[PDB]
Design a protein around this ligand. Sequence first.
Ligand SMILES: CC[C@H](C)[C@@H]([C@@H](CC(=O)N1CCC[C@H]1[C@H](OC)[C@@H](C)C(=O)N[C@H](C)[C@@H](O)c1ccccc1)OC)N(C)C(=O)[C@@H](NC(=O)[C@@H](NC)C(C)C)C(C)C
Ligand SMILES: Nc1nc2c(ncn2[C@@H]2O[C@H](COP(=O)(O)OP(=O)(O)O)[C@@H](O)[C@H]2O)c(=O)[nH]1
Ligand SMILES: [Mg+2]
Lengths: 69, 430
Amino acid sequence: KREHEREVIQKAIEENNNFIKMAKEKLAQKMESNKENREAHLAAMLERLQEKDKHAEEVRKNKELKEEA
Amino acid sequence: MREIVHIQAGQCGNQIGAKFWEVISDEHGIDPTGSYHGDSDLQLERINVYYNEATGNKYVPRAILVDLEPGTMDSVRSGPFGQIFRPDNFVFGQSGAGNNWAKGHYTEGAELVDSVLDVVRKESESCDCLQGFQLTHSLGGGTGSGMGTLLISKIREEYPDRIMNTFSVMPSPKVSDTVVEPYNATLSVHQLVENTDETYCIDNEALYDICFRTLKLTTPTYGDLNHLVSATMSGVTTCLRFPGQLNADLRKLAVNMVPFPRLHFFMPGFAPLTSRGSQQYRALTVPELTQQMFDSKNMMAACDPRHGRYLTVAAIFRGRMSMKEVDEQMLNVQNKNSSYFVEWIPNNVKTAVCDIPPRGLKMSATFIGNSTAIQELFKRISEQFTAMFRRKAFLHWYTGEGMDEMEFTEAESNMNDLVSEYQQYQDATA
Ligand SMILES: CC[C@H](C)[C@@H]([C@@H](CC(=O)N1CCC[C@H]1[C@H](OC)[C@@H](C)C(=O)N[C@H](C)[C@@H](O)c1ccccc1)OC)N(C)C(=O)[C@@H](NC(=O)[C@@H](NC)C(C)C)C(C)C
Ligand SMILES: Nc1nc2c(ncn2[C@@H]2O[C@H](COP(=O)(O)OP(=O)(O)O)[C@@H](O)[C@H]2O)c(=O)[nH]1
Ligand SMILES: [Mg+2]
């Protein structure tokens, strides 16, 4: 009976600890995934804007090429 | 000098425990300060059964007060008889047990139980010749039920050859709306079947119904309920406390009352039934005492004794009366209703008479029955248990404390086995 009593309270501790552990890990996973997704969305936006800048350089390059002819 | 050590646990346990000490202190002529002021030598002759002697000829209850929250014990320490208790014998926590057997038995109670056992040990060591223990508690809450049965098991381990006696208050939906009480009670009965020698089944269902039906109290209080309990506890301990022939110690009582070790759950009864301050002016006659003490309406367990058979009976008469008339009337009950007494235990009804009446009465009588009808009580608890357990309802409160469902299944099976064993001897012929 005493061994059983010890087992019950260690079980209660273990399940509480495991709850905390899994909550902790779920949250770290979610936060890392969110961080990476948001950063990727910004990176893509900037990438498109930078392609506009390049395009604009070509337009002016094109105008300069046309000009002397 | 055969000492009994008294333990009271949880709210109910301490409430009825404190009332027990008020009632028997007055009977023994001990005042709230522990000073004796009585007029009869009969009062002191076996005073050492329940009291230690101090210097100044102070008498101190051999009582240990236990709870997982301070409220009720603060109440007691501020009550009338608060000072009478040994201050170091107050053992309490702060967390409470939240009406949860698992908290009392496995988690919260486990943190406190060694402290209690330390006090128990100090009291036992002081004993010339310890008889055993008596515990007051309810089965429906968390501390008295869970920690109370934890204590019973630990005390049995340290004192395996001593008698363990309990006054156990059974829950009823007539008195409590807490949904988990049938769980707490079933888990506790499982413990009691294995580890006590004698258990007085004090049923809140019966207590409430006596107050409402018989005493005509439209709004019964715990005070009213406990008035019945303390009258009963006084009556059933009379043979332990005063000079006498029959059932004069815990072991002799058990040998007279318990023919099979698991069947040690007693139905108490009392007459006359009174409310607090009813203060009645006519004494009952011996025939009246005898008729009423055996009546269903006077039982403290809500079981119809006519639905079962008596294995054994103890009857205690108190007051100045004709012992001849007592004998005649007791014989009349048995000879008039002989079919309700098992025929394979000859002469199974024993009678004691004590000259000192309880306070406020000239005449009273107390009944202790080992009846197979007590199965009705366990059946009632079992039905309430199964209604929830079949859907595993409210179990998360228990599994959160580390318990497994298997433990519930085992407790239920053991109580249903107990029920079946009563039925077996009910139907048994010589
Ligand atoms: C039938 C169930 C108990 C018995 C009563 C009783 C509780 C009581 O006695 N309580 C609540 C602690 C205070 C105590 C009494 O005040 C009312 C004091 C005077 C007392 O009796 N005090 C005694 C002397 C004291 O030793 C003591 C004992 C136990 C606990 C605390 C204090 O109050 C009527 N209750 C809950 C009720 O009647 C409640 N009704 C119900 O619960 C109903 N269901 C909604 C049914 C079960 C009756 C109403 C209050 C809503
Ligand atoms: N007869 C009686 N029953 C009580 C008293 N106090 C609580 N109860 C009952 O005891 C059960 C609740 O247990 P309680 O002792 O309050 O919980 P604990 O403090 O955890 O042991 C319920 O069935 C209540 O109706 C009391 O003073 N007298
Ligand atoms: Mg309570």
